[PDB]
Design a protein around this ligand. Structure first.
Ligand SMILES: CCCCCCCN(CCc1ccc(O[C@](C)(CC)C(=O)O)cc1)c1nc2ccccc2o1
Lengths: 270, 270
């Protein structure tokens, strides 16, 4: 019954709105302007960066950065903190996916460990366009060029996210679509180390039917959107793998820089 | 129309049968199961290999294990010969895909270039089970044990493919399904360097529709098989990536000597 699938879709969309403070709808409203209400301050260089810590709250350094925790590192610990923040929002969302909390506690942990970053990059795309990305709840906007100009290793951390975002965003998905998609990502029975794969795949199948109908009803004219979206899951895994190896490089070139315990746990070069 | 999709399906199945000697239906009869007659020669040890090699249809080298070209190298090289063969079979199959030959020639070469490894492992799964893989047109069977026991570098070469095959084969696809799936892989759109993505994605759209109808008619009891199959591409990709990686490492094993050229030419890297 497609009626039961529509309810699941509404339920997941509802939980999504309740778990994620900055939706795609809000992100696009901020980026596309035509607004005086919430135009973001723009960071495209060191100076605007300094200024940025004025109209927008930023627990980081404004002045000199070199001999005082450089800008690259400052921006990096910022992403770090924001990522853990996202893991907590995604975890809250996960618990709302029917069946998720009734699974083996060990597998709940495994599903989150492997799904969190894939979800992070999917949602990160909502806050990006070809020119940059929204920051601090949408009050700021850091330029893609400014980011690609950071010190040797940090200079290329974000580029692959942008490359993915521009392609992914061309699919023109809205929050109700993404809510089902993120749920699908989490319930992957092919995650390494899962104990009970069957209960996980039973839920994903239900989620997949939900996503399929949702895309057919919401995008009547977009041929094979469902399949096209599912293939994007390959680009996500790649982004993760690529990010991981870059993180191993960072770890060795910056022995004075620290990683958040949560993020470190999830990570295992995995 | 459902008619254009069935025709496309039937057309691909026919060309697939004509292009690939060993069909999965053919290989499954041999593997797990009997169909008692002409049982494959089993390579499970060094002695069984030496014997099988000198008694199998392997046009290349003979058994010589004594400070002269180790077994692992001869096995590895052997898989290279068969891979070059398959590439030509994949190439002929590609040309039968409606619209393929009509694409920009550089684009045709690009699609084949980046799609042959994904296709090779996909079809390899057809000849594998959890304990081994069919060899020499199915006249042989090299056990998973003997393979994982090879030298340090070569022992971890095929294992990852066995793991993928185990999961992939659980989908229980047959040649009619695989025929369309392989064509979808070939007509990707995200291969690097493509010049005209539109016609490529347009054909894949048509192929995906065909694959979807085929799975629903051929496996009416398998819910969301279409979606599950597409997500298996995330695995194939990692496999390929991980594979070119070990490959580079192998290069850092065997190298020198003015003997073997022209042969090294015929292979390169694929
Ligand atoms: C439901 C989840 C919503 C996810 C929203 C993510 C916003 N974000 C963080 C993106 C990110 C960047 C870098 C990351 O690297 C770390 C922290 C490295 C340990 C990781 O977790 O792998 C991880 C995640 C982010 N936003 C921005 C804006 C500008 C510059 C950098 C930046 O990073």
């Amino acid at each position: 019954e497609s009626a039961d699938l529509r309810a699941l879709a509404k339920h997941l969309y509802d939980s999504y709105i309740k778990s994620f403070p900055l939706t795609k709808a809000k992100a696009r409203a901020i980026l596309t302007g035509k607004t005086t209400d919430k135009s973001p301050f723009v960071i495209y260089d060191m100076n605007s960066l300094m200024m940025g810590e004025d109209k927008i709250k930023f627990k980081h350094i404004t002045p000199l950065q070199e001999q005082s925790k450089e800008v690259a590192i400052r921006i990096f610990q910022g992403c770090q903190f924001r990522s853990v923040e996202a893991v907590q929002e995604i975890t809250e969302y996960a618990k709302s996916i029917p069946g998720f909390v009734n699974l083996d506690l060990n597998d709940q942990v495994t599903l989150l460990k492997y799904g969190v970053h894939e979800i992070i990059y999917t949602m990160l795309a909502s806050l990006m366009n070809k020119d940059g990305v929204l920051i601090s709840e949408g009050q700021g906007f850091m330029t893609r060029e400014f980011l690609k100009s950071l010190r040797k290793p940090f200079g290329d951390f974000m580029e692959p996210k942008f490359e993915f975002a521009v392609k992914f965003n061309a699919l023109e998905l809205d929050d109700s679509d993404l809510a089902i998609f993120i749920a699908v990502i989490i319930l992957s029975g092919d995650r390494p180390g899962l104990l009970n794969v069957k209960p996980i795949e039973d839920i994903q199948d239900n989620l997949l039917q939900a996503l399929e109908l949702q895309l057919k009803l919401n995008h009547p004219e977009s041929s094979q959107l469902f399949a096209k979206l599912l293939q994007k899951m390959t680009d996500l895994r790649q982004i993760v793998t690529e990010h991981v190896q870059l993180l191993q490089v960072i770890k060795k070139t910056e022995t004075d820089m620290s990683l958040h315990p949560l993020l470190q746990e999830i990570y295992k070069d995995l």
